[PDB]
Every structure is written in structure tokens, then in C-alpha cells.
From Swiss-Prot, chains A, B:
SUPFAM superfamilies: Lipocalins. Belongs to the calycin superfamily. Lipocalin family. The lineage of its organism: Eukaryota, Metazoa, Chordata, Craniata, Vertebrata. Coiled coil: none annotated. Keywords: Allergen, Disulfide bond, Milk protein, Retinol-binding, Secreted, Signal, Transport. One of its GO terms (molecular function) is retinol binding. Under physiological conditions beta-lactoglobulin exists as an equilibrium mixture of monomeric and dimeric forms. Interaction with LMBR1L which mediates the endocytosis of LGB has been observed in PubMed:17991420, but not in PubMed:23964685. It is found in: Secreted. It comes from Bos taurus. This is Beta-lactoglobulin. The gene is LGB. GO terms for cellular component: extracellular region.
Amino acid sequence: TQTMKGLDIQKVAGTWYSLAMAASDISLLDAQSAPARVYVEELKPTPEGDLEFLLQKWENGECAQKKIIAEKTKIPAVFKIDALNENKVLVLDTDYKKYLLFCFENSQSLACQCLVRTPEVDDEALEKFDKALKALPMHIRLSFNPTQLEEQCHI
Amino acid sequence: TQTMKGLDIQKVAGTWYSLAMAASDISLLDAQSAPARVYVEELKPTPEGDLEFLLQKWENGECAQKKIIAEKTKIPAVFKIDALNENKVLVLDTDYKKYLLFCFENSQSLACQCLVRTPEVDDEALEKFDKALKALPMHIRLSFNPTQLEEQCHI
Ligand SMILES: CN(C)CCCN1c2ccccc2Sc2ccc(Cl)cc21
Ligand SMILES: CN(C)CCCN1c2ccccc2Sc2ccc(Cl)cc21
Ligand SMILES: [Cl-]
Ligand SMILES: [Cl-]
């Protein structure tokens, strides 16, 4: 939809925090176990330029660990998930050292996140997140406080 | 917190739609039966200047009807609910004919709504809602589409 020009994927490696989330549909986020309520722990680019995500997900009554690889495409900012469905991960913007904005898109519904490196509310990153979101048909948004950011599944 | 100057309460009577909702805590809105997921049907000012609300609420697996009176205070924009808890309704802004912004506050947690007269997405009213919200510690926001606005409990 809107993407990071000149993305250097190797430089997104490491720790991240899902500071804020937004989605096209309320049901994607408005339950503790909602489909898009997915918490990023780490991004692990592969030497071949795929992007592995370490995630948490509340499911069947607890906070489960998940590990998913999004495969590279010819566009550096766009990755594809191997599944029954054809979903994409799009990297909208990042400065590598503080924030990264991305969206998960199907083939439609959209969930986006504002990721930050540290458990702090970064108003500048959130401002960039909101600017990105005005071009998208979002209907739910939420953000987490520093206490929650240090808990499993942001409880 | 922030209020409508010169509110004429009699002029808020009639049909309204909860176009958007925001709250201080994610748990107040992030479930179909969450405490602040309350849908406004009608406002009925009394001759004595109290404000009755006709509402819907998803509870015990369906969309229940609710009727609550908020009693006047010496401030025209602030009403008080008779309960074990001391909660207030604050009217932030309205033009009577298109939109009304209000907040429910306890003694703390806050839920606010953008009400509109018709089942339409009013970007100007939502812009006013967002401006009001930047002065408040909100962590979840959602908005409804015209199809949902015509359904019981916005399903
Ligand atoms: C259940 N899980 C194993 C799948 C996670 C899918 N998923 C996802 C995929 C690849 C990289 C990052 C993410 S976060 C995310 C946020 C919103 C939505 Cl809707 C989906 C995702
Ligand atoms: C269960 N129900 C009978 C009580 C509704 C209480 N409540 C409320 C009260 C008076 C006038 C309007 C409202 S809407 C609302 C929005 C958010 C929250 Cl948190 C509370 C309320
Ligand atoms: Cl939104
Ligand atoms: Cl918000």
C-alpha cells in the first residue's frame, strides 16, 4: 500500500515492542485472543533476506509463543507468508534504531503495528503511525503502556 | 475535564448514533461485552433538566436495552449518575444538529463517544473527537460503519 524506500532488512534485526496496533475491522483486535492481537518479540532476518518473526499470541486461555517466517519478494519492503491464505507483510517505515511501522494484509483486511525498540511511549513514532493510518480504512486502534510492554502478551 | 460552554440541554434530545468510542484502558472497550461498549439510542432531557439515556449493551450473550438517568448538577455540561460509584457524564461539545461529544468518567477511568444524528461517517465530527482526545490519556479507539450503525449493538 505505502512502503519504505531503500529498506535494509538486516538492520531491523533484534528486540522490538508492539507499542500500538490498528486494524481495518474491530473484530481483529477487540478481544484478548482476536486474530491481529499478536505481540512482536524479535525480528530475525535470515542471511538469504527472509524475515523471521518471534511473536506471542493469546490463545486457548494463555500466552503462546509463535515463530513465523515471511519470505522475501522482489520488493525489499514486502514479504509473503506461506499458508493456505496469501498474506503479506509490508514495512512502511523505520529508522532502525527507534521505530518500525508495518502492516499485515490479506486478500480485504489489514492490521498494522508501531514497533519500538524500548518499553517507552514514543510520541514521534506514534505520530508517524497515525500519519500512515490516515491513508488506510482502520476502525480500531490501541496502544500499550510501559508496564504492559514488559509483560507476556501485554497483560 | 473540557466542556461545552452555554449548553442548551433541551436541544440534545432525540436520536443519536455512537459513531466512535475511546477509552483510557483497553479492557473498557476490547470485548463485545466490555464495560464501556455502550450504544446510545436516544437522549431524553427531563423538564427539570436531568438527562435520560436510552442505551444498548451486549451482556449475557445478547443485546440488552438499558435506561439510565444522569442527574443535573450546577454545571450545565456535567451530570451525575446515581449508583454505588460516583460517575459523571460530561458534555464536551455539540452543534445539536449533527454531533455531540461526551465522556463518562469515574473516580481513574474515562470512556468518551462521538455521537452523530444520522448513520453516516462524519469526518468533521471525528476530527473534533480526536482533538478532544489528545488532552486525555486514551489507549483504545474504535469507530463504526453505516451498516453497523443500523444494527442492534452495532453487530
Ligand atoms: C497466529 N500467528 C502464528 C500468525 C501471526 C500472523 N501475523 C504476523 C505474520 C508475520 C509477521 C508478523 C505478524 S504479526 C500479525 C499482526 C496482525 C495479524 Cl492479522 C497477523 C499477524
Ligand atoms: C450498563 N449500563 C446500564 C450503564 C451505562 C453507563 N454509561 C453511561 C451512563 C450514562 C449515560 C451514558 C452512558 S454510555 C457509557 C459509556 C461508557 C461507560 Cl464506561 C459507561 C457508560
Ligand atoms: Cl483507527
Ligand atoms: Cl486512543
